[PDB]
Each structure stands twice: as structure tokens, then as C-alpha cells.
């Protein structure tokens, strides 16, 4: 029935640890549509990208398991797409007995966070690569502020991605593999499934980073959107407005360094609150 092979396939899609190229190219198409919340047309386009990808890989078989059985879902509105996305699985047989409701939900969640990190990184890179080129610079100090803040943010996201992949994914997978080989028994698969649901479940409880992070990403999206415009009295006024925006972002980032040593930045929580009511 060749269970072993399918297990590897599962580790590939559900765990998502070998689908990188596809997530990147999935994000690039329909970037604007995802930034916003659900609109009807959003959906048509999103579904097209799905139908195209189902044509593009898996030809290792008469019938693509990955492509066919797994599709990605969007929730209807008429906040942002990113929340509204979920990942959906259509069930096989007799393999279906193994899989359980809880398990698919666990996987869909690692995929969503992963995906979240992934879109932000792509956007951080494209903006910087542009900025290194001649047209954005030189028709003084303000330039230097944009350069430093950008370098620092890239660092922060890469350190995050290292910890998220090592400390979570690499660790759990390492363990999963042992459990299947060492004991080759049916009992060993049941044990392992339980292990696969945990550590993601612990990690969920330990890390609850994303809403804060997300606030900072929106400020980042705005910043970068402005930076893309390139080349008097107006510029300077606008610069001033950006400058207060930068200091606040700089002060939270300064607080955030402390968190890596020992968790929680009061300052970012405190900025949202202040905005709620001072």
C-alpha cells in the first residue's frame, strides 16, 4: 500500500517544509488582492491561481495526491485576506480512517503562520533590492535613517525565521523520524501522531507574537509604500510626518531586543493601548 512514501508526501505538504517555491509564486500573483479583505473578484482570481498550481506539479503518479486532495480556502466577507485564509483537505479511502479532524486543523495552522512569515519576507526583500539601485537615491540624513531601519528589520525577521524553523519544525521532525524507524510498529505511528499534534500545540501556547508583529508589519507596509515613490516644501512636511512614525517604530524595536533575552515588549502593547485610549 506503500504507506512510507505517502508519509513523506504528507511531511512535504501538510508540514509544508518542501513547498517553498510554490508559496512564493502563489504570493506574487494577486499581491494587492491579498493585502485587502475579501471581495468577490478576489476569490475568482485566487481560485484561478489554485487551478493553475494543480496543473504545475506532481507527475510522479497517474493521480496527483497533493494537488487533487488538498486545496486552499478563502472566507467570504462581501478585514484582510490573510485572516480569512484556511487550508482544506478532501479525504481519500482507506487512508481516510487514519486522518482525524484535529490533525488537519493542526497542519492548517502551521501552514498559515508559515505563510504569514513568508509573504512579509518577500516584500521586505523586494523593496530593499530596489533601494540599493541609483534611481531612489540622489536627485541627506533622512536617507540614512531609512537605510538603518531597513537593515535592522531584515535582521529581526531572519532571526525569527531561524528560531521558528529550528526550535519548532526541525526539532519536531527529527523526533518524528526516530519514532517511526526505531520502533517499526503500528503502535509507533499512533504515538507519533500524538507527538505531531503536540509541540505545535505547546508552541501555540508559548508564542502568541503575531498580532503585535502584524501591527508593526502594517506600519512597515505603509513605510515601504511611501519609499517606492522616489523623485521642495511638501517633501519636508511629509518627511516630518514620517519621522515621528520612525521614532515610535524605533523605540518599540529598542524594547523588542530585550524580549529575545527575556520575553514580552510592554512598549508595543502600550502603543496600541495608548491609541485605544491614552
Amino acid at each position: 500500500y506503500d504507506l512510507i512514501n505517502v508519509l513523506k508526501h504528507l511531511q512535504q505538504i501538510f508540514l509544508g517544509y518542501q513547498s517553498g517555491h510554490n508559496v512564493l509564486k502563489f504570493l506574487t500573483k494577486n499581491m494587492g488582492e491579498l493585502t485587502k479583505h475579501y471581495r468577490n473578484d478576489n476569490n475568482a482570481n485566487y481560485d484561478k491561481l489554485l487551478q493553475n498550481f494543480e496543473l504545475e506539479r506532481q507527475s510522479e503518479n497517474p493521480n496527483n495526491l497533493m494537488r487533487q486532495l488538498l486545496m486552499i480556502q478563502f472566507d467570504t466577507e462581501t478585514k484582510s485576506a490573510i485572516y480569512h485564509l484556511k487550508f482544506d483537505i478532501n479525504i481519500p479511502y482507506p487512508l481516510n480512517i487514519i486522518i482525524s479532524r484535529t490533525c488537519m486543523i493542526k497542519y492548517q495552522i502551521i501552514l498559515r503562520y508559515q505563510l504569514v512569515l513568508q509573504y512579509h519576507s518577500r516584500l521586505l526583500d523586494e523593496t530593499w533590492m530596489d533601494l540599493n539601485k541609483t534611481p531612489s537615491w540622489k536627485y541627506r540624513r533622512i536617507v540614512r535613517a531609512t537605510r538603518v531601519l531597513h537593515a535592522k528589520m531584515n535582521h529581526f525577521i531572519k532571526t525569527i525565521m531561524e528560531y521558528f524553523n529550528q526550535n519548532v519544525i526541525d526539532k519536531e521532525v527529527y523526533s518524528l523520524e526516530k519514532c517511526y524507524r526505531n520502533p517499526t510498529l503500528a503502535v509507533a505511528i499512533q504515538n507519533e501522531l500524538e507527538g505531531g499534534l503536540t509541540n505545535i500545540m505547546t508552541n501555540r501556547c508559548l508564542s502568541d507574537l503575531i498580532p503585535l508583529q502584524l501591527q508593526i508589519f502594517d506600519i512597515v507596509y505603509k513605510f515601504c509604500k511611501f519609499i517606492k515613490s522616489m523623485r521642495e516644501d511638501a517633501a519636508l512636511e511629509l518627511i516630518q510626518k514620517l519621522i515621528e512614525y520612525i521614532s515610535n517604530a524605533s523605540s518599540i524595536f529598542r524594547k523588542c531586543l530585550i524580549n529575545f533575552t527575556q520575553e514580552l515588549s510592554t512598549e508595543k502593547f502600550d502603543f496600541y493601548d495608548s491609541s485605544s485610549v491614552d
Partner: protein, 445 residues
């Protein structure tokens, strides 16, 4: 399909390492001497190295996505072998002139202008043939006629023509001490193109490379071709994670973004481990993470001769360390957390200490022993000691007013000899900015 890459090979050195490089990948990905697959490789699944680096005739005959430029010698070596049929012969261009490059920049450059059209056609054809072109890798020599002169033109052309795609260079700097008096002039002229026309440059210093090749590998009579074997090994391994699926953090763009945050720094130095496992008759044994980080700082054991003082206590702008093999990460993470705190380089309090780490495994298309290995990619201020030395020699040839002549006879240098002076002045500015970067003073605070 993939983010496809065109490799451009220029000069004797560039053609020698470039040919070897394809030979290593062919061994690694179990294919022939013309990329012919063996029977278990016509089975389902192999690594996705294939479409970025390679193209298919789609009969399972893989071909390198490489462009060869030189004159007759290097091309003749490829033709004698079964590596001529491996490589697409249209991507290979061979020219001469009645007044050839001759290991002088000006001749290589005048010829470059004549065949401006020809090179751009060749390039556009390969670009048109490409799906999802990510960018270019230039492989070359500054001890080349071709690699220097022809190379300087192509760098200029690539700058103007397309600004959208990423340009990376692997530039080999001479082995050891001065070979000809006019060397500083040849070197600065190529170096001009390299600062302005490229987004990123990986410097491979032959002197450093040679020390390893003579001593470690043991060559009683050493040569450039022998050293190039090491370089093709360094370049290939650095691409291992790109070619190895499960990685997409290995990615050229995310690496670039993290490493390079202004066009003023972009000179990379690599450091490497192992250099052992050749001609087995001595012990080969697995290192560990600490041992790996400690070897890299040493000057002639690392690939680059930057002329550092006391083995890099110098200002690091950024560090990325890439570890190869399976080994407990945790052990390392704690040790690394202490290594930044001791702080081997220098830093200012005007920027954070940014340290990145990448872990990459090995291909299962070839057998492994899982030995502790690594490459490091860092941007360091210490390279400038080399540039100062070049500048001094350059100032001195200028001052004498003698041996300016051979360049000056060509029309470009005859109309204006202003151009060299402008570059020297600029070059002093590049060094000045790198020095400012060591301090706090570098930004607006």
C-alpha cells in the same frame, strides 16, 4: 520554472573553474560527462537543481546554463574533452583580433567595443530561451586579458541594459605579489567596473587560495588550474542549499537583502571548512561547530587574503555562517550566543550586531559521511588594506609618468588620461566611507 541563472565565463581562470564546476555538479547529481542519467535516476523524484542551473533537451540529457568567452586556448581544452557536447556550442563564443587582449586591459576593451553587438545578441538569445530569469553570475579573472577587458565592457552593457535582474560576480584577485609593473593599472580599471556596474561581488583571493592548495592539498609544482579546483568546490557547495529542495531561505534575494544594505559595501569574503579529504592516506575526521567557526578567522587558511591584522578583530558589517551536515544545533546556539557577547570583531553602538546563521544538509543523490563542514559569508572592512596597497602602487606609476604609455596609445586614454585620475580620486572616497563605517559616525547619529 526555477529562478534561472546564466553563468558567464571570461578569461583563462574563469573558463578553467567554470568547466570544473560543471564537472562537480555532474558527479554529484549522478549524470554523465554530457549529463546522461543512469538507470535509478529515470525513477521518480530527484533534487530540483535541474531547471535553475541546467536545461533539458528532455531526453534526460542535462546541459549547463553557461556562456563561454575567451579566445582559442580555453575553448580548445573544452573541445578536446566530452565537455564540448555537454555545453551548448552557441553559448560558447570565441574571437581573436590582429591585436589581441594580450593580458592588457585596453586591447581587450577595444575589441570588446567591436563585438558589442555580438555579445549582446548571444546574451539576449540565452535570455529569451530562459523561463523566469533570476540573474547573472559572472565567473572571471583580473589576470585575464579577456576576463578583464572584455569583462569590463560586458559589465557596463549589463548595467545599462537591464537594472531589474540581480548581478553577482566571483572575481579572482592575483596570486601573491606583483606579477608585472602595470598590474595596479589593470587591476583598478577592472575594479572600477566592479564597484559601479555590479550589485554584489564575491572576492576570491588567489594568494590565500594558493596557500591552501600548496600546503593542504600538496602540489610540489602549483598552478592556477590546480587552485581553481578549490574555487569550483567553494562556489558549488555555496549553491548546495539552492539546488537542494526544502530550502527557500537559501534564496539569493533573502541572502542578499540581509547581507547588503547599501551599494557602498558589497565586497564579500568567504571562509571555509573542510579542505581535507583528498588522496586518502591521512586521517579525516569530523570537527564540530566551535572548531569550524575558529578555523575561518585564520588568514591563509580562509579563501581570502584581505591583509588583516591579528586574524580579524576588524569591523564586521555583517556575518552569515552556513553549517553543512547534521549536528545538534542547540549546542551551537548557546556557544554562538556567547561568541557574539565576547564579540570577536569591532562594532559601534550606532548599529546592532547582526549575525545570521544558515543550516544546510547534503544531497542524497550522492553518498555522504555527514562530516562537519561550513562556509561563511561576511562583509568586512579589512579588505580595504588590499585596496590601499593597489592605490599606492597606482599613485607611484602615475607620479613617475612612465609606463603610462601602453594604455595611452589607445584612443580612449589618448583623448583623456583624466579618467584614471578620476577613478583614483573616487577609489580614495570608497576607502574613506568604509573607514567611516567602523565608527558610530556612519549614520545621522
Amino acid at each position: 520554472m526555477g529562478g534561472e541563472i546564466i553563468t558567464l565565463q571570461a578569461g583563462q581562470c574563469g573558463n578553467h573553474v567554470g568547466k570544473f564546476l560543471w564537472s562537480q555538479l555532474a558527479k554529484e547529481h549522478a549524470i554523465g560527462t554530457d549529463g546522461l542519467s543512469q538507470l535509478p535516476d529515470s525513477s521518480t523524484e530527484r533534487d530540483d537543481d535541474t531547471k535553475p542551473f541546467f536545461r533539458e533537451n528532455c531526453r534526460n540529457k542535462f546541459t549547463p546554463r553557461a556562456i563561454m568567452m575567451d579566445s582559442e586556448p580555453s575553448v580548445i581544452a573544452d573541445v578536446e574533452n566530452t565537455f564540448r557536447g555537454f555545453f551548448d556550442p552557441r553559448n560558447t563564443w570565441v574571437a581573436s583580433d590582429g591585436a589581441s587582449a594580450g593580458n592588457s586591459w585596453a586591447n581587450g576593451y577595444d575589441i570588446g567595443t567591436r563585438n558589442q553587438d555580438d555579445i549582446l545578441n548571444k546574451i539576449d538569445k540565452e535570455i529569451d530561451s530562459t523561463d523566469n530569469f533570476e540573474g547573472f553570475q559572472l565567473l572571471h579573472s583580473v589576470a585575464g586579458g579577456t576576463g578583464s577587458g572584455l569583462g569590463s565592457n560586458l559589465l557596463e552593457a549589463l548595467c545599462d541594459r537591464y537594472p531589474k535582474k540581480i548581478l553577482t560576480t566571483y572575481s579572482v584577485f592575483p596570486a601573491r605579489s606583483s606579477e608585472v609593473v602595470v598590474q595596479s593599472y589593470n587591476t583598478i580599471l577592472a575594479l572600477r567596473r566592479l564597484i559601479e556596474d555590479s550589485d554584489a561581488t564575491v572576492v576570491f583571493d588567489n594568494a590565500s587560495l594558493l596557500n591552501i592548495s600548496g600546503k593542504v592539498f600538496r602540489n610540489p609544482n602549483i598552478d592556477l588550474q590546480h587552485t581553481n579546483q578549490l574555487i569550483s568546490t567553494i562556489i558549488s557547495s555555496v549553491t548546495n542549499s539552492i539546488r537542494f529542495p526544502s530550502y527557500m531561505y537559501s534564496s539569493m534575494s533573502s541572502i542578499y537583502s540581509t547581507l547588503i544594505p547599501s551599494p557602498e559595501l558589497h565586497f564579500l569574503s568567504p571562509s571555509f571548512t573542510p579542505f581535507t579529504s583528498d588522496y586518502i592516506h591521512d586521517d579525516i575526521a569530523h570537527k564540530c561547530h566551535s572548531s569550524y567557526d575558529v578555523m575561518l578567522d585564520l588568514l591563509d587558511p580562509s579563501n581570502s587574503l584581505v591583509s588583516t591584522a591579528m586574524n580579524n578583530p576588524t569591523y564586521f558589517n555583517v556575518y552569515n555562517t552556513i553549517i553543512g551536515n547534521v549536528e545538534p544545533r542547540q549546542i551551537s546556539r548557546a556557544m554562538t550566543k556567547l561568541q557574539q557577547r565576547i564579540k570577536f570583531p569591532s562594532w559601534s553602538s550606532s548599529a546592532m550586531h547582526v549575525n545570521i546563521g544558515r543550516r544546510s544538509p547534503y544531497l542524497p543523490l550522492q553518498p555522504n559521511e555527514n562530516e562537519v563542514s561550513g562556509m561563511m559569508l561576511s562583509n568586512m572592512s579589512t579588505v580595504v588594506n588590499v585596496f590601499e596597497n593597489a592605490c599606492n602602487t597606482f599613485d607611484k606609476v602615475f607620479a613617475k609618468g612612465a609606463f603610462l604609455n601602453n594604455y595611452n596609445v589607445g584612443d580612449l586614454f589618448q583623448s583623456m588620461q583624466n579618467v584614471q585620475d578620476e577613478f583614483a580620486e573616487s577609489r580614495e572616497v570608497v576607502q574613506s566611507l568604509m573607514e567611516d563605517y567602523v565608527a558610530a559616525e556612519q549614520d545621522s547619529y
